[PDB]
Amino acid sequence: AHSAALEVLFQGPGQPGFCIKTNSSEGKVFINICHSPSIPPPADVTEFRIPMSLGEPHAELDAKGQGCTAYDVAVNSDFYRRMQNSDFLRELVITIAREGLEDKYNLQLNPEWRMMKNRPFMGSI
Amino acid sequence: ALDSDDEFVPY
């Protein structure tokens, strides 16, 4: 009961930012936080709902040649810059994105996620 | 210590 994701339409491809590693009961799940100018930033508040696209799952191979699931979640480019300079803002958006994907596709993702520091994106582009 | 999948791949 904190903040929430708001799904907007988007194609796609946008541009990668960073990659989050988590899992379901079945296997590994990767959340690719991407960004695009064509996606609205959060509305200026008078007194947080984050607009973001929730991409369809696409299977990719992990480092061991095993299939895993990856989701592309795109956010506003300017809002993304603000995310890069804010650990609080970034981690919140992660949680928000994860719960957005859980809602849309009926998944149970691991809250205890891990940040990929070398890999910016799981898949192609 | 790295994650098993934490390696740079030029998308």
Contact A62/B at CB under 8 A? yes
Residue ranges making up the domain that contains A96: 1-125
Mind spelling out the 3-state secondary structure of A30-62? Answer: EEEEEEECCCCCCCCCCCCEEEEEECCCEEEEC
Q: Give the N- to C-terminal CA distance of chain A in Å, as an integer.
A: 35
Query: Mind telling me how many Å the CA of B1 is from chain A's nearest CA?
Result: 11
SS3 of residue A95 by DSSP? helix
| Total domains present in chain A | 1
Quote the crossing angle between the two packed helices A77-84 and A87-105, to the nearest 10°.
130
> Tokens standing for B7?
């390696």
Q: What is the DSSP letter of A41?
A: P
**Technique behind this structure?**
X-ray
Q: Which residues of A53-70 are buried (b: 16+ CB within 10 A; e: fewer)?
A: bbbeeeebeeeeeeebbb
d(CA A40, CA A45): 14
Q: What share of chain B is helix, strand, coil (3-state, %, to 5)?
A: 0, 0, 100
Q: What's this structure's resolution in Å?
A: 2.5
> Tokens standing for A63?
């480092």
Where are any strands of DSSP class E within A55-113? 58-61, 67-76
Q: Do A62 and B7 touch (CB under 8 A)?
A: no
Q: What is the DSSP letter of A117?
A: S
d(CA B7, CA B5): 6
Contact B11/A at CB under 8 A? yes
Q: Among A124, A111, A122, A121, which residue's Cα sits nearest to residue A17? A: A121
Chain A: residue whose CA lies nearest to B3: A116
Contact B1/A at CB under 8 A? no
Residues of B within 8 A of A116 (CB-CB) are 3, 5-6
> Tokens standing for A112?
């205890």
* Radius of gyration from C-alpha coordinates of chain A: 14
